[PDB]
């Protein structure tokens, strides 16, 4: 375990779900000496090598080390079907350059079920109230889930990580908190959900009273 290290990270879910966004794979290289501050990357896709790549150096923070990153913008549907993005980092300090491959989690793409749950009476006795959005039944875990009382997004909400269950898929919960008053008045709130198995990789359900 000598020489520098390499870390290949996947694109962002949201970025891979909507074409207006730019999805890219990043290959980071840490521990690059000042003696040989030079690194050559090799990008391969499903075997076939690629050459889109882009890079720039940054040695800093608390090390006499250099940092290297190679951004490889990617075609949406590419990743979405699964593609080996093998990255081969080369530096003398490395006997034989290091290569690491990443890709969409494999399995059978399943579509999420989205249900919104009103705050149970018991809680209404409080100042603020909890609104639940249940997203169960997806594959992969890769997903996006947000709230909006109006076009404007909401701030007071949390989301559990995706949890895998019996069925073999993934589900999670998102809890949005709102001052009872609002909720009471009879406002409107919705949780949007972006998944690869949604009609347009997107859907939203809304919560209200009565």
């Amino acid at each position: 375990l000598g020489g520098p290290s390499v870390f290949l990270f996947p694109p962002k879910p949201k970025d891979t779900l909507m074409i207006s966004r730019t999805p890219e794979v990043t290959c980071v290289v840490v521990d690059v000496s000042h003696e040989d501050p030079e690194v050559k990357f090799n990008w391969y896709v499903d075997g076939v090598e690629v050459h889109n790549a882009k890079t720039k150096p940054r040695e800093e923070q608390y090390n006499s080390t250099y940092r290297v990153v190679s951004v490889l913008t990617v075609l949406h549907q590419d990743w979405l079907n699964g593609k080996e993005y093998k990255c081969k980092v080369s530096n003398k300090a490395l006997p034989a350059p290091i290569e690491k491959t990443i890709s969409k989690a494999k399995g059978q793409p399943r579509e999420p079920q989205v249900y919104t749950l009103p705050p149970s009476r018991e809680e209404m006795t409080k100042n603020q109230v909890s609104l639940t959005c249940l997203v169960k039944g997806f594959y992969p875990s890769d997903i996006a889930v947000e709230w909006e009382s109006n076009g404007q997004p909401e701030n007071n909400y949390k989301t559990t990580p995706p949890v895998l269950d019996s069925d073999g898929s993934f589900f999670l919960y998102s809890k949005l908190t709102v001052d009872k008053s609002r909720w009471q008045q009879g406002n409107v709130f919705s949780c949007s959900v972006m998944h690869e198995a949604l009609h347009n990789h997107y859907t939203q359900k809304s919560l209200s009273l009565s």
């Binding site: 375990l1 521990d31 608390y62 006499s64």
Partner: protein, 167 residues
């Protein structure tokens, strides 16, 4: 008469718990007498040889050492510090006057393989090396008065060394 002297083999008077240490005694021997007297803080260590050997040091070997003969007056003491742990910062002395070269070795237990080593000076890694080696410096900087120490990977685990004060 001449005052004898104890020398350390190697120049490291600060080692870890496996380090072999040799104390060569320098002085004059009489005609029918080629013997040496060794002292470990008051206590007398039997061996006659003009050389004392510590195969595998323990923290009990730590201390002041004196050696003598019959033609040499007792030698001043030699402090031998025995530390415990994975790493240990070494140097001949951390007393650096205005201009003067620095030599820091980052000794590790049983010379175990240390990697991705980094010498630090005040929470700031002065230098990085893929494999373990030594850290060099020429004249002072009137600011070298920083607390140093090293770290690295003994196998999978990360080890640190006690921080010393190069003044």
């Amino acid at each position: 008469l001449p005052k004898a002297v104890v020398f350390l083999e190697p120049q490291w008077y600060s080692v870890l718990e496996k380090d072999s240490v040799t104390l060569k005694c320098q002085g004059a021997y009489s005609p029918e007498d080629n013997s040496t007297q060794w002292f470990h803080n008051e206590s007398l260590i039997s061996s006659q040889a003009s050389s004392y050997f510590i195969d595998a040091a323990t923290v009990n070997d730590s201390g002041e050492y004196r050696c003598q003969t019959n033609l040499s007056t007792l030698s001043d003491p030699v402090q031998l510090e025995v530390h415990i742990g994975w790493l240990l910062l070494q140097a001949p002395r951390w007393v650096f006057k205005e201009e003067d070269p620095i030599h820091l070795r980052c000794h590790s237990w049983k010379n175990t393989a240390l990697h991705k080593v980094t010498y630090l000076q005040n929470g700031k890694d002065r230098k990085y090396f893929h494999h373990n080696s030594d850290f060099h410096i020429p004249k002072a900087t009137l600011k070298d008065s920083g607390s140093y120490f090293c770290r690295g990977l003994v196998g999978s685990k990360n080890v640190s060394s006690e921080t010393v004060n190069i003044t």
